Amino acid sequence: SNVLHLVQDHFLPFDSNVTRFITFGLNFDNPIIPFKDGIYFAATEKSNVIRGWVFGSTMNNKSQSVIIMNNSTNLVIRACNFELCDNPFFVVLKSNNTQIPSYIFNNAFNCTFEYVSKDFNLDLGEKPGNFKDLREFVFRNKDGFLHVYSGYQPISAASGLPTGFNALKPIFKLPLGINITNFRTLLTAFPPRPDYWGTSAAAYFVGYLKPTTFMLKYDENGTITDAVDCSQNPLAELKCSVKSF
Amino acid sequence: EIDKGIYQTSNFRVAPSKEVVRFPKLSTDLIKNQCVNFNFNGLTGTGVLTPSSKRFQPFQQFGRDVSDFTDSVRDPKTSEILDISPCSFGGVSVITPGTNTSSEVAVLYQDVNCTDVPGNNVFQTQAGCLIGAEHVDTSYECDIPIGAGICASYHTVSSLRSTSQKSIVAYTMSLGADSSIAYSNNTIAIPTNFSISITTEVMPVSMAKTSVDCNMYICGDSTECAN
Amino acid sequence: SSIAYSNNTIAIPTNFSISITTEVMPVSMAKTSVDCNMYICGDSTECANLLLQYGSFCTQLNRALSGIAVEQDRNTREVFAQVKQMYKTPTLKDFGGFNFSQILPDPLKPTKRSFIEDLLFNKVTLKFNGLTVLPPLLTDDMIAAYTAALVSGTATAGWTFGAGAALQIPFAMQMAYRFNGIGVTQNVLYENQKQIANQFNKAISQIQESLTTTSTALGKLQDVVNQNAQALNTLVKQLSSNFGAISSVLNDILSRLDPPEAEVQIDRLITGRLQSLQTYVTQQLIRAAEIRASANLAATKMSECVLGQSKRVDFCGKGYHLMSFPQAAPHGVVFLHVTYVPSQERNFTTAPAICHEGKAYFPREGVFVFNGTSWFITQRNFFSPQIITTDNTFVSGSCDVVIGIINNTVYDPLQ
Amino acid sequence: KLQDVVNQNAQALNTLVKQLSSNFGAISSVLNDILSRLDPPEAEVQIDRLITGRLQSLQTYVTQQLIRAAEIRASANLAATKMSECVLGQSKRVDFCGKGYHLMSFPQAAPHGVVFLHVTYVPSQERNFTTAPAICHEGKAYFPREGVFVFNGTSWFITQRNFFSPQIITTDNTFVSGSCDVVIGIINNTVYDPLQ
Ligand SMILES: *[C@@H]1O[C@H](CO)[C@@H](O[C@@H]2O[C@H](CO)[C@@H](O)[C@H](O)[C@H]2NC(C)=O)[C@H](O)[C@H]1NC(C)=O
Ligand SMILES: *[C@@H]1O[C@H](CO)[C@@H](O[C@@H]2O[C@H](CO)[C@@H](O)[C@H](O)[C@H]2NC(C)=O)[C@H](O)[C@H]1NC(C)=O
Ligand SMILES: *[C@@H]1O[C@H](CO)[C@@H](O[C@@H]2O[C@H](CO)[C@@H](O)[C@H](O)[C@H]2NC(C)=O)[C@H](O)[C@H]1NC(C)=O
Ligand SMILES: *[C@@H]1O[C@H](CO)[C@@H](O[C@@H]2O[C@H](CO)[C@@H](O)[C@H](O)[C@H]2NC(C)=O)[C@H](O)[C@H]1NC(C)=O
Ligand SMILES: *[C@@H]1O[C@H](CO)[C@@H](O[C@@H]2O[C@H](CO)[C@@H](O)[C@H](O)[C@H]2NC(C)=O)[C@H](O)[C@H]1NC(C)=O
Ligand SMILES: *[C@@H]1O[C@H](CO)[C@@H](O[C@@H]2O[C@H](CO)[C@@H](O)[C@H](O)[C@H]2NC(C)=O)[C@H](O)[C@H]1NC(C)=O
Ligand SMILES: *[C@@H]1O[C@H](CO)[C@@H](O)[C@H](O)[C@H]1NC(C)=O
Ligand SMILES: *[C@@H]1O[C@H](CO)[C@@H](O)[C@H](O)[C@H]1NC(C)=O
Ligand SMILES: *[C@@H]1O[C@H](CO)[C@@H](O)[C@H](O)[C@H]1NC(C)=O
Ligand SMILES: *[C@@H]1O[C@H](CO)[C@@H](O)[C@H](O)[C@H]1NC(C)=O
Ligand SMILES: *[C@@H]1O[C@H](CO)[C@@H](O)[C@H](O)[C@H]1NC(C)=O
Ligand SMILES: *[C@@H]1O[C@H](CO)[C@@H](O)[C@H](O)[C@H]1NC(C)=O
Ligand SMILES: *[C@@H]1O[C@H](CO)[C@@H](O)[C@H](O)[C@H]1NC(C)=O
DSSP: EEEEEEEEEEEOSSOOOOEEEEOOOOOOHHHHHHOOSSEEEEEESSSOOOOOOOSSSSSSSSSEEEEEEEETTOEEEEEEEEOSSSSOOOOTTTTTBBOOOSSSSSOOOOOOOOOEOOOOOOOOOSSSSSEEEEEEEEEEEETTEEEEEEEOOOOOOSSOOOOOOOOEEEEEEOOOOOOOOOOEEEEEOOOSSSOOOOOSSSSEEEOOOEEEEEEEEEEESSSSSOOTTTTHHHHHHHHHHHHOO | OOSSEEEEOOOOOOOEEEEEEEOOOOOOOOOOSSSEEETTTEEEEEEEEEEEEOOOSSSOOOOOOTTTEEEEEEEEESSOOEEEEOOOOOOEEEEETTTTTTOOOOEEEESTTTOOOOOOOOOEOOSSSEEEEEEEOOOOOEEEEEEETEEEEEEEOOOSSOOOOOOOEEEEOOOOEEEEEOOOOEEEEEEEEEEEEEEEEEOOOOOOOOOOHHHHHHSSSSSSOOO | OOOOOOOEEEEEEEEEEEEEEEEEEEEEOOEEEEEEHHTTTOSSSSSSSSTTTOOOHHHHHHHHHHHHHHHHHHHHHHTTOOSEEEEOSSHHHHHHHHETTTSSSOTSSSSSSSSHHHHHHEEEEEESSSSSEEEEESSSHHHHHHHHHHHHHHHHTTTTGGGSSOOOOOOOHHHHHHHHHTTTOOOHHHHHHHHHHHHHHHHHHHHHHHHSSSOTTTTHHHHHHHHHHHHHHHHHGGGOSSSSSSSSOOOHHHHHOOOHHHHHHHHHHHHHHHHHEEEEEHHHHHHHHHHHHHHEEEEEHIIISSSSSSSSSEEEEEEEHHHHHOOOOOOOOOOOEEEEEEEEEEEEOOOSSSHHHHHHESSSSEEEEHHHHHHHEEOOTSSBBBBOOOOEEEOSSSSSSSTTOOEEHHHHHHO | HHHHEEEEEEEEHHHHHTTOOOOOSSSSSOOHHOOOHSSSSHHHHHHHHHHHHHHHHHHHHHHHHHHHHHHHHHHHHHHHHIIIIIISSSSHHHHHHHHSEEEEEEEEEEEEEEEEEEEEEEEEEEEEEEEEEEEEESSSSEEEESSSSEOOOOSEEEOOSOOOOOOOOOOSSSOOOOOOSSSHHHHHOBBBBBBO
């Protein structure tokens, strides 16, 4: 309550050089991305285009890969071993808005981790307006615990990631214990008709966490109301030296 | 032999009453508003347990102070946020006239309330609980500084007539005499006589020139020592 | 600036100003005390047994703090308690036209301190481990009574009450004497009393306005707080450092480890925390000595500026000193100094002595000036030209010795 | 004040000496004993602890003594100032040499200190009168010089501010400086002309 709390830890620096992975209009992207000591994933969508993720090390039936599918009711946290098929995209039908069964994996062999998340009715198809929904995920590996810190933003995105500030809460501390080296975004594609495929006007953005020092401004209610990246600017360093804002 | 003064003989500490432990061994869940040895989720502290006021985040369990002290807790077995505060701890100090004058003493608990103290009358003052001092409404010049404007002395309390009890009396300080001089627009006060007053002022000039050889103190003439 | 040394001309002030300035002086510092065992061992029975080995570090490191505390009380007494008899604030707060309402306490109000003291208290913005802060002996209301007594006494008795018995005097001739002290004569005040009162009221109002806004011209009384807190801050922080031990918390080491090497770890932590306390005590002693010196200066300023008219240059204020008013503040005293500032100079011409008839006349308590037509004699600090007379001058020797002697008559009134 | 500096010095020295007989983690508190009971390779382990303890105690003593010395030096400087200003002269400064108005000061020696006997003039037995800023005699004001106008009841007199010697008002004791109108509290009276 009513403190300015310094912390050296693994945060996304203020105003970073952040990569944008776009799935909109005509094109779809399902690439692998390096997971460097923690990633910051932004899902900006209106059609629930982004469901989950595939975190895995080697992809040769000897590596444990975590997969989550946050698509309406069928949410299962399944960290399992399997042959990784090339394009296991989600398939939400265009003009029907139904998930079309696609093999997320070729089989299931080990499944070192299995948790059944609860079912909740949720939308899946293309929706009007702006992709006002920003769902934020930060991942961190400590001692085999993947901590996931999530947030939601209804702020508008006309050109990209908007300017502002907000904090994310630590929902999950999942003890996977596996040396994950790869992160692939699970995405849905809207096919006008089978074998044609398409994408809704959405996007996702990947940034990399870096170890720096932050002055989290913990308010009376215990919410981080603001912060400063010490290494961002010289005057930022001086703020961290005087701790005053 | 003791001379007149407050002397700060020792410290004071209120012992915890009951031990309470919880888990997410067995649990003795809650004692409130008493110094208790709380053991919430494996953390053991001795402090008064009180209900917490401000609203925690649902994941946030322990409340922290500016100096990183924990001032609130979440029960691991039951669910409730509790404010945490330290138990009282002051330093007892003995007020006593010169042992030549009397062997009567009073005690001063230097921060605590008179509810915590374990001697016929007590006086709650801003300094602390003053036990053995008979409060009076009269005022004199300060003799023994308690503080917050109150000083104690060895005076006749006038119990019955004046029974010569001469008990320790704690009174609020008198700043000085009250004088009556009035402003007037055409009156002047001219002295008609004078006095020759001789006073003494004492000033320290020097202290004793001491020398302490390091080797003699540290090693005491030991050949092996000093290497 | 350009100032020309001419061997024949002088500059004489013709007008003046009454200027009131504020000087802020810390007097006392917060009295804190610490117990070793609570801070170091943190209520553990295994510790405070090893601490017996280290001897009597604790009686010394607690006695030093107690010595600082008594010194602070002494400083307050030396500074405020210089008034022997608490003179009551007069019902009327207009003394020959001078408005003392802001410096004296207001009977109607409930603060029992002056508007100036109220603003000063307003501006300066303010259980832990074995640390306590003892209450100061004299309350904020009691020193307020001392300063109110001083202000009323100086308003109603003048320079007198400071030395010997208090003697009342109308404020008009009190200010007249004090004007006579700086060299300006009585007639100047007895003829410019309305103007002087106007400037005096304006100056007090201006000081009130300057303090009223968020101007931070009270830093000296805040640093003594600030640094204090900082020290009292960092000591606590040092309880979170493991000086090369497994953990900072003593109970954590005692529980996790078996007694034999737990003893080594505990010894490490004791050494660290004892070093911390020693540094803190050292710093407190150094700060206390500085505070004592400031208080000693504040006491001397009260004794000379307030209870009399100090003639020391630039001691009390920037100008010729007239009267000083003390005011209380958090942990210090604020002096308001009244100074007579000359202004509106005029070029003149001058000579050392005047040759009248084969004799040299020298001026006493003045200077020879040439207004343009004839020669006059006037006091150096204010322009009041008087005719030259055997009374104003004094005759000594012939006319040849003095360099610059001029020819003019010396009018003797009696013949 | 002299006794307290001696007491603090003695207490510092006694605490220093008392600190000697104390194990600092060592098996014993006497260097002789540890040498006798232990071979040098394992004797140095204890001897280093004792050296650290005694070094730290010595540093504390030296530090405190230095600060105390500075305070003593400041007092001595003030004593020298007081000697120079009061003993060898007369001081206008208030409450610097005695209480009241300073006349003389005599020095006396004391163990490690100096005692000043100040001699002061204290007014007493006041008499309260009525008074006037000035006098308008023949169309001109007559201000006092080095005195105050007083009225005992039969005539107005002029006297010094600190002792009542009443004297008749003349042109010797006054200067005119202006007309009667301006002064706030003018009072009518005759100024005696010695020449007339
Ligand atoms: C000396 O200066 C003061 C200050 O300005 C003069 O007093 C002012 O006089 C004018 C005209 O007489 C008034 O309008 C102002 O209100 C006055 N102000 C104050 C503060 O008194 C004074 O007249 C000057 N005297 C001489 C001889 O020059
Ligand atoms: C003395 O000064 C006080 C303070 O300025 C005067 O009181 C003020 O009077 C004016 C008008 O009468 C009001 O507008 C202010 O609010 C008053 N201030 C306070 C603090 O009361 C007072 O009139 C002056 N009196 C004399 C005799 O000079
Ligand atoms: C210089 O001094 C002369 C002599 O005092 C002044 O002349 C007098 O001025 C006063 C003022 O009105 C008159 O009452 C006298 O009658 C004047 N005397 C004579 C002989 O004229 C003169 O005004 C002064 N001038 C300057 C510039 O200082
Ligand atoms: C002041 O007056 C005296 C006498 O009038 C002057 O003394 C002589 O003045 C005459 C003027 O006619 C000179 O010629 C002489 O040299 C002066 N000195 C003598 C006779 O010894 C005196 O000089 C005058 N001073 C000034 C400065 O004018
Ligand atoms: C006021 O002073 C006058 C002058 O000193 C006093 O009158 C003198 O009193 C003495 C004693 O009675 C007589 O010897 C003188 O002869 C008086 N003077 C004259 C001129 O006759 C007067 O008594 C004083 N009054 C008071 C009340 O002190
Ligand atoms: C001092 O005496 C003079 C002269 O008797 C007084 O002046 C008179 O004042 C009244 C009232 O203003 C006028 O009506 C007269 O005309 C004045 N007379 C003269 C000759 O000027 C003066 O008032 C007296 N002062 C006091 C304080 O009583
Ligand atoms: C805490 O939450 C309450 C409830 O909405 C709100 O009124 C208050 O302003 C909040 N305080 C802070 C510091 O955000
Ligand atoms: C104690 O007090 C009595 C009377 O005041 C006196 O005779 C005696 O000497 C005192 N004792 C000491 C040790 O000063
Ligand atoms: C002492 O007790 C009274 C009444 O119970 C309470 O009002 C006061 O706050 C207590 N003092 C402290 C320091 O808590
Ligand atoms: C008069 O004074 C002004 C400045 O005050 C100066 O510049 C000038 O030279 C002076 N002249 C004479 C004749 O003194
Ligand atoms: C002043 O100096 C000038 C310049 O040399 C000189 O002519 C004049 O005689 C001097 N007068 C006096 C009185 O010194
Ligand atoms: C004269 O002044 C004295 C000194 O304060 C006072 O006690 C006395 O009452 C005054 N006499 C009067 C006002 O008649
Ligand atoms: C001040 O003096 C005047 C006369 O100069 C007088 O009328 C007035 O009453 C005096 N003040 C008081 C408060 O009496």
